[PDB]
Amino acid sequence: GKLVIWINGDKGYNGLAEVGKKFEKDTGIKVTVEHPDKLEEKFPQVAATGDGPDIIFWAHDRFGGYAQSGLLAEITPDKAFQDKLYPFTWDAVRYNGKLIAYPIAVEALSLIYNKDLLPNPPKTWEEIPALDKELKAKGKSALMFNLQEPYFTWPLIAADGGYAFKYENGKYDIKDVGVDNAGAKAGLTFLVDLIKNKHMNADTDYSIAEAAFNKGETAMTINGPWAWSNIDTSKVNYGVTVLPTFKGQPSKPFVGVLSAGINAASPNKELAKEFLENYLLTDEGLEAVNKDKPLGAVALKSYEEELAKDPRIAATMENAQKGEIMPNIPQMSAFWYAVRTAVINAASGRQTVDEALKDAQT
């Protein structure tokens, strides 16, 4: 008779509670929003026993596994409602040919540049090696971003053909991995060339890049919305824009889709569908959630146009559309363990790009 919703503690759960209050006003149904500790693990264990919340909020990548275990119920949005969200957001919530969650928010990396040092950021990766030489003459550096995580280096590596798992007919082919194809080889060759020519340092990590950019030492970095707040505290006159292209092809950052799934053990699935479609996934509900804690870019077209008036969210959405949707299969774990090693080995000069990428292929 009631709705119980779980959402991570870093999200605007108070705005979601306000949306639940509006739902209660319109229907009388009490909506209880919670932010349990250790939600990521907590949800699957409780759901496996037929318990847990009616609605669960999380990145789409995990939901696929939840769909394999039968913890998520198939959603039934009509064509009219499906037309309200960007198709690529729907692509992120598809498992075994069925929709298993409602896309809520879109998240992807973007190029953050210092306007004072770089009023006109480069549109191509090939411009960076020369652009750096200029800034080095002034005691600055063109670009510094986390190289320790594949999540940050993949956009350049997979710009011209690279991909984690082939995706077709709403299905991932785990036997088709494009780690060691020509595009990935060219991308990592460019990255290691940047390292070799001293335009970049192999040991640079998240902390070093963040400190360098926020102190005005480097003209550019690559980061997502989560870092914006820190930059705001630094008072750097910064802008967020699209990632540079490689060989004329857009950089393909991983796209994280915050989605809402319906518990398979929920006897109140119609109420969850009503709340999500007619109350949350609207301009008013998304605005209410946004006012508490920003969602960045959103899957709903109507509110996305309003949010895009700020160039930062517009750049985030444009990068996400050109990016690669995060696969929702467990095999990605191995991928994370594989390419990482390659980037560690290829960047260190100990292994060739061919060698490293072929070893990470298997």
Author numbering: 5 to 366
Copied sentences from the primary study:
Here, we show that a generic and kinetically biased ‘Gembody’ (Gb) interface, previously discovered through trapping in crystallo, can also be trapped in solution by kinetically controlled side-chain-to-side-chain bond formation in a manner that leads to ready generation of complexes; these display ideally balanced interface flexibility and yet relative complex constraints, in turn allowing rapid cryo-EM structure determination, even of small targets. Ultimately, after a survey of in-solution covalent bond-forming methods exploring differing natural and unnatural amino acid residues, we found that Cu(II)-catalyzed oxidation at a pivotal C12 residue site (together with the presence of needed Gb ‘gem’ substitutions previously discovered through iterative X-ray-guided engineering) offered a route to direct and rapid, high-yielding formation of disulfide-linked homo Di-Gembody (homoDiGb) without side reactions (for example, off-site oxidation) to form a robust covalent interface. Furthermore, the success of DiGbs for high-resolution structural solution is enabled by their relatively small mass contribution to the imaged complex while increasing the maximum particle diameter for better particle alignment. In summary, our plug-and-play DiGb strategy improves cryo-EM resolvability and resolution of small proteins through constraint and increased particle size with a simple and robust workflow and can even enable simultaneous structure determination of two challenging targets in one dataset.
Strikingly, within weeks, using an essentially identical workflow to that used for RECQ5 and SPNS2, the homoDiGb method was applied to 43-kDa MBP and even very small 14-kDa hen egg white lysozyme, achieving reconstructions at 2.45 Å and 3.16 Å, respectively. Lastly, we also observed clear structural evidence for covalent bond formation as a driving trapping force for formation of the DiGb complex. In the MBP:homoDiGb structure, there is a unique interface different from those discussed above or any class of nanobody crystal contacts. The side-chain-to-side-chain covalent disulfide bond gives the Gbs a ‘U-turn’ in this joint, enabling the first β-sheet of both Gbs to come into contact but not close enough to form direct hydrogen bonds. Nonetheless, the resulting assembly proved constrained enough for cryo-EM structural determination, with or without local refinement, further highlighting the value of this kinetically controlled approach.
